[PDB]
């Protein structure tokens, strides 16, 4: 009760899972940043070390302007790399946005 700076376990359900569900949940620990994440989501928990490749997270969102499809010939979506810690763009998800959004993994191809 006297952490100032406690071990922040949240699990981040993510949509590019290697898992078999086709959306899954892995949960985090001390200040786990987007790349000791797409660890975490990785994890197999066995040796825990599965072939961790250039897998990457993205917050996929839009302007809620419009409804349907808020054109689709702009990319408004974030690619999260290790920088850019994946807690910030929780974070950053304001209350307005609420429902929209989710984490996608996507590969280094393009």
Known sequence: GEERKCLQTHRVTVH???????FTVF????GT???QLLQQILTNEQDIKPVTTDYFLMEE????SKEKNE???QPFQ?????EEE????LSSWFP???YMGRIVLKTQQE
């Open 86 to 89: 994946i807690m910030q763009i």
């Open 61 to 64: 969102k839009y302007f809620i």
């Open 33 to 35: 940043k987007a790349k």
């Open 16 to 22: 590019g899972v290697p898992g078999p569900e086709p």
């Open 71 to 73: 054109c689709r010939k």
């Open 96 to 98: 307005e946005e609420g």
């Open 78 to 82: 974030r690619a999260i790399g290790p």
């Open 27 to 30: 949960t985090i620990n001390g």
